Amino acid sequence: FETRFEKMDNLLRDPKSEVNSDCLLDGLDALVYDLDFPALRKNKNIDNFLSRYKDTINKIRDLRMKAEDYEVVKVIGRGAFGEVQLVRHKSTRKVYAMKLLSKFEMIKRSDSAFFWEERDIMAFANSPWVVQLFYAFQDDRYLYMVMEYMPGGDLVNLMSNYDVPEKWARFYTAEVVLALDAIHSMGFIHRDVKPDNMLLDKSGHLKLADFGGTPDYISPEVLKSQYGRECDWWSVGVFLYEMLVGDTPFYADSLVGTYSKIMNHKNSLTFPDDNDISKEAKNLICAFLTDREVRLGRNGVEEIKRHLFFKNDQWAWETLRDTVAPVVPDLSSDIDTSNFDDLEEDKGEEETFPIPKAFVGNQLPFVGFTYYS
Amino acid sequence: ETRFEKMDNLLRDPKSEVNSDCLLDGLDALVYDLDFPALRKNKNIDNFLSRYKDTINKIRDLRMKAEDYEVVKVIGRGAFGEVQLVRHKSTRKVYAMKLLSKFEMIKRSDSAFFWEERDIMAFANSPWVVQLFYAFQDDRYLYMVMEYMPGGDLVNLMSNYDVPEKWARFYTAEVVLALDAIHSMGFIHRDVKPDNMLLDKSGHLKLADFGTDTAVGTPDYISPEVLKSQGGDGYYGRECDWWSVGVFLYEMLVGDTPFYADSLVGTYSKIMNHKNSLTFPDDNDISKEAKNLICAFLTDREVRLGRNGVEEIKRHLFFKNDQWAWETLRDTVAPVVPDLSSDIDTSNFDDLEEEETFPIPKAFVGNQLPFVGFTYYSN
Ligand SMILES: COCc1cccc(CC(=O)Nc2ccc(-c3cn[nH]c3)cc2)c1
Ligand SMILES: COCc1cccc(CC(=O)Nc2ccc(-c3cn[nH]c3)cc2)c1
Ligand SMILES: [Cl-]
Ligand SMILES: [Cl-]
Ligand SMILES: [Cl-]
């Protein structure tokens, strides 16, 4: 009966716990945002609670991390549920990438739970090959994720600017293998591994970001189901082929043509006559681009790491991150975004949730999102 | 960095409204208030409850609950609940536990009187104030675990004994020191009556804090300025407690309250007309200094003995004696030292022996909201 106090204290300090300090503050913050509407304050219990917690909730919001703590330098990404900005912390002056997710768009589209895996993977992967999330926070309108800035840009940009030789493809594939292993070890399946998720740091080394499938990268077991770690390894094979050949293995003008080439992979997968790809590179691509039942990746990464395609003189698995990367970005400053398409800031007022007549709990799906490193 | 440390301080500070216990209360209250079939038709509510189901059940089990105590006897009962003598199942230590009905507090629109009672007992850290070790709750009640005061109250003592002036001097002086300790914390007792004066195992006084009319409880002890204060007629200071001391000293020495009347209106009017209603019976065996002290307290606050501070009260001739000094008063032998048969002895308390619940809500009502932040753990 004395041990209960210690057990509780552990739950409050564990960053992975659903009742840690940040989650409990999120619940109070969410409760105040969801009750503080004129029609709800006609209920005496609600009106009195808000008056009693007014000073402390205002003080908590000011101490806790908020959007105001960061200055927006540029917008480097934009999507249906929000955008990714290059920001500078006002106090420390450190530059970061900050993703914003619109709570209004997520509630409006009954799609308010995809971000949990993204958050957890980047917060807890603790890997040289996974983009790190330093802070997650929120207000009544947005979720925020402060990640390390990757100034090299993505593999989509790299593949369009360069003809990738095998030495480079070996390096990028090996870093993707380690990145996927770190995510799979945590019990997660990335589900949309594609060059868009592969980002390069100031040294030109690859890290996976996790977000959102795409036709060219979709495995046969998905097209015949409308899964395991194998669906991720199919995507690595598509990626290796696209790097070495310049085109995706199952490209077609239409969506249907690509789907049929994917299903008919045993006959559609061909290497061009005008290509001098090694035997071991073709063997690795074919070991991934095969049926789920015999695919490279089912048994784990050790099998992939032992593959002969990765045998080289430059590096070993333990010194891969220590080698000079093939494309090292030349950066003018800590806010250089030359490896990204600069987008414009959208400053216009955005639509918010309908003003409740009774308690609806729009903040409830987001309790527990806050995270401090 | 300093914001991070400031936040961490607020989460651990027992006086903070956002400490771990208060934040767990919010989550607990939210789950109790949302978990109804008509509310779970809302996807946000239904999903939140399913996501927090396991953790809330685990939290409720780890946290202090009524099940941790065995009920030995009921030693007090009121409009909003009861006070039980309990034994902690694990440590087997005996305590006094007050229960406050959430249903009755919501029903009588009286769900905020317990905050000062909780804070005074939890943070006084004084030999003069009853200590609150734990404060906890469930969907039906508030629980206040206090140190047991086996000597009973001054209401009981005054009925069992004819109080000589030597005893009256001792009890009045202990009440003066207990009130000074409460005033030093920034509080006004406002409920100084013999019901609030409890005696420990040595027979020394500690104040508990509670009311026993609709808003003021028993009016016999209420000062003219606090009676006026109801219905926006001015305000009152800490000097309202000194009036109550004058009433108590009079009741001890005379046997009746100075402004007694059959009706509440009669009492209210005698209090306001104190300059003419305050009389001592013809059979006056009370000293000149005892009457002078009573009259110095039972006057208008502008000229009352409490004004200027406690030093003025302490220097009054009624307290001049050979038995004790102000600094050693709690070290002297009390007039009535209780003879206790066991740790369960309730001989100094009177013998005491349909629990209505909240209706099922159609929409969120928030019946648990007035009680978020009540939980308190001493260690
Ligand atoms: C679908 O709706 C959500 C949404 C809104 C915007 C964009 C996206 C896609 C997206 O997450 N890209 C992204 C993520 C991380 C970084 C980065 C990290 N460190 N340096 C750079 C760069 C880009 C999704
Ligand atoms: C009317 O609403 C408030 C209310 C509800 C129930 C009861 C009461 C009266 C009440 O608090 N008496 C009381 C208080 C403390 C102790 C005690 C402490 N340590 N040992 C003993 C004993 C008795 C008030
Ligand atoms: Cl209106
Ligand atoms: Cl690392
Ligand atoms: Cl390096």
Residue numbers in the entry:
A (entry chain A): 7 to 218, 236 to 249, 255 to 401
B (entry chain B): 8 to 219, 232 to 372, 377 to 402
Which statements did the authors publish about this structure?
To facilitate further validation of the method and confirm the postulated binding modes, we obtained co-crystal structures of ROCK1 in complex with Compound 1, the most potent inhibitor identified in the virtual screening campaign, and with Compound 22, an inhibitor we considered structurally unique. The crystals contained four monomers of the ROCK1 kinase domain in the asymmetric unit, of which chains A, B, and C were relatively well defined, while the fourth copy of chain D was quite poorly ordered and not used in analyses.
The pyrazole class was the most populous, with fifteen active molecules. This phenyl-pyrazole moiety fills a similar volume to that of the purine group in a native ATP-bound kinase structure. In addition to the phenyl group, all actives contained a C- or N-linked amide group at the para position to the pyrazole, providing the connection to the hydrophobic P-loop group. The structures were solved and refined to a final resolution of 2.34 Å (Compound 1) and 2.74 Å (Compound 22). With the Compound 1 example, the pyrazole nitrogens that bind the hinge motif are 0.8 or 1.0 Å apart between the experimental structure and the docked model, while the alignment of the protein atom component of these hydrogen bonds show 0.4 or 0.6 Å separations. The mid-ligand phenyl linker ring has a distinct tilt in the experimental structure, but the overall ligand position remains co-located with the docked model. This is despite a large difference in the protein structures where our crystal structure model was built, interpreting density to indicate an inversion of the DFG motif (which also leads into a disordered activation loop) such that the inward location of the phenylalanine 217 sidechain creates a very different platform surface for the base of the ligand binding pocket. Since docking protocols generally do not account for such large conformational changes and protein dynamics, the consistency of the experimental and docked ligand poses in this example are all the more remarkable.
